[PDB]
Design a protein around this nucleic acid. Structure first.
Lengths: 49, 112, 195, 48
DNA sequence: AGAAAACCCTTTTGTTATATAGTATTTTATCCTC
DNA sequence: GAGGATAAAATACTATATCCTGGTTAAAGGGTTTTCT
């Protein structure tokens, strides 16, 4: 439940930021955070902390 | 040229970050390098229980835009302040500056 | 999801199964997938040959123009040196001032020459990158890619992140790779055959 | 440290010039991915 | 009208790991060759 | 002198019997709201 919550939060934030318009750098960092969230959802602890 | 850069910060706490950044630039008195630090904040409205009410949302939520010339001393100074994770850029050794067009866009919105 | 995301099982687990399909080392995937470097998804071609001749002419023009501007700057510096000599010989100032101004002038001239050399080297490196631009090549040093895209916005497409790997997989035939690998197995020998 | 062959051999193969390069190299390992500078390196080494 | 106690949200220096034994894959370093 | 090939080292992943009972299960900070004086 907590991991799904994290993924949904980050997805909503990135969707908003794309719709509202933002510089490429912020969008790229948000996509990185989404990637890390999904990686943690599927296999927690395989990469990084 | 004081190209704009973005520094991440802990969620929530943002104002303390900017204020401490100003104080720390005072401390080392490198005023000819740091020019301006702003946290854009639009004001919108919502109806809570059938009543129009105000609200204050900071678009680009969680980051702080700052002016900085690219000197490693400035790099350490910015990285040193509390509650500042790091520089969001193209690589750690040197951050990446946001293009003038994006800063023009945010200036237009903040004006509006 | 609002942006594509890669499945960790087929990316991290040793052996890296995305690394074999695309022929990329695990570090390159670690970079492209976590937004740390750009990757050239698709690079244009024989349109190149023609535009390459034309752009060789254009870059010769650009290099000559920049060198002319730098030569004008050096000429202005030489005029400043002449004014310095006039100041030296006009009134009474012994070795101290003479040496100071001459050291300053030679330092400025050498700095201008170094700037010219560095800019010309940068443009030559840009030319080398363009003439040797192929898919699955990592462009670190963001500023370099920004220069390449601003100058030659066509002739290639560069991306960064999972969607870049998706584009790579889309533009990837599975038969030619198998044929090449079977050829290498038959003939290669050594660690090349082993890989 | 002139009474053992190991120390002299290490001295011969050091590739470190002066003192600042030593501190910068130590910085490159203690804390990777940072802009090395003498002041910060000395401060961190002392603080450790 | 101001102060104090009660909601609603968010999020969690490098720590301390006293490991072995086995295998399998990536660096890298150095040696040999042209 | 430069490039390729092979050892070396350096990291990355995997595994290490059966069964039973007892105590805990979040805190802390910031921002906002309501009642009492």
């Amino acid at each position: 439940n907590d991991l799904y919550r994290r993924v949904i939060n980050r997805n909503n934030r990135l969707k908003r930021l794309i719709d509202l318009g933002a510089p490429e750098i912020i969008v790229n960092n948000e996509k990185r955070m989404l990637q890390e969230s999904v990686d943690a959802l599927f296999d927690n602890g395989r990469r990084g902390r | 040229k004081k190209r704009w850069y973005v520094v991440q910060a802990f969620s929530g706490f943002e104002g303390r970050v900017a204020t401490s950044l100003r104080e720390h630039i005072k401390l080392h008195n490198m005023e000819d390098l740091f020019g301006e630090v702003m946290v854009p904040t639009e004001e919108v409205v919502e109806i809570r229980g059938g009543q129009r009410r105000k609200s204050e949302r900071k678009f680009f939520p969680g980051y702080v835009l700052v002016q900085m010339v690219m000197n490693d001393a400035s790099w350490h100074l910015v990285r040193s302040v509390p509650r500042v994770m790091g520089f969001i850029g193209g690589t750690s050794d040197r951050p990446a500056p946001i293009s003038d067009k994006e800063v023009d866009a945010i200036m237009n919105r903040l004006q509006q | 999801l609002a942006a594509p995301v890669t499945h960790i099982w087929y990316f991290k687990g040793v052996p890296s199964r995305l690394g074999y399909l695309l022929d990329l080392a695990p570090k390159d995937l670690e970079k492209i997938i976590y937004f740390a470097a750009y990757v050239i998804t698709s690079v244009d071609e024989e349109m190149r040959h023609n535009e390459l001749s034309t752009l060789e002419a254009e870059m010769a023009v650009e290099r000559k123009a920049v060198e002319d501007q730098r030569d004008g700057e050096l000429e202005a510096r030489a005029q400043k040196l002449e004014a310095d000599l006039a100041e030296l010989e006009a009134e009474g100032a012994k070795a101290d001032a003479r040496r100071k101004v001459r050291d300053g002038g030679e330092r400025e001239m050498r700095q201008i020459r170094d700037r010219a050399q560095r800019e010309l080297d940068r443009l030559e490196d840009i030319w080398s990158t363009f003439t040797k631009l192929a898919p699955k090549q990592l462009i670190v040093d963001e500023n370099l890619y920004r220069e390449l895209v601003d100058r030659y916005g066509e002739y290639f497409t560069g991306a960064m992140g999972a969607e870049s790997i998706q584009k790579l997989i889309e533009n990837f035939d599975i038969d030619a790779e198998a044929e090449s690998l079977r050829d290498v197995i038959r003939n290669g020998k050594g660690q090349k055959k082993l890989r | 440290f002139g009474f053992s062959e190991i120390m002299r051999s290490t001295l011969e193969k050091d590739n470190t010039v002066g003192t600042d390069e030593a501190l910068l190299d130590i910085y490159r390992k203690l804390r990777p991915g940072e802009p090395p500078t003498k002041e910060s390196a000395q401060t961190l080494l002392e603080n450790l």
